[PDB]
Design a protein around this ligand. Structure first.
Ligand SMILES: [Mg+2]
Length: 87
């Protein structure tokens, strides 16, 4: 199926949350940005999950941000979904 959610990886560790919000906001309207962290140090893991308002924007994120050079790195972007099951 289609997805309004994308994975954004290979992000330089020094990139901040404000910075990644801005980049994704340039592509399209962002509903939520989930940046991943190492909880012990508070440091960025260099990847995030972004929910966009609609399917066109997420697709635009994948088309434009996959291979996009940010800092000294090339970003990886693709569609994301997940299940949730309890134990
Ligand atoms: Mg990564």
């Amino acid at each position: 199926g289609p997805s309004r959610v994308v994975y954004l990886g290979s992000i330089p560790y020094d990139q901040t949350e404000e910075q990644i919000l801005d980049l994704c906001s340039n592509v399209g309207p962002v509903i939520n940005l989930k940046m991943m962290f190492d909880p012990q140090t508070g440091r960025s893991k260099g990847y995030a999950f972004i929910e966009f308002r609609d399917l066109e924007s997420s697709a635009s994120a994948v088309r434009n941000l996959n291979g996009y050079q940010l800092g000294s790195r090339f970003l990886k972007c693709g569609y994301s979904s997940n299940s949730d099951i309890s134990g």
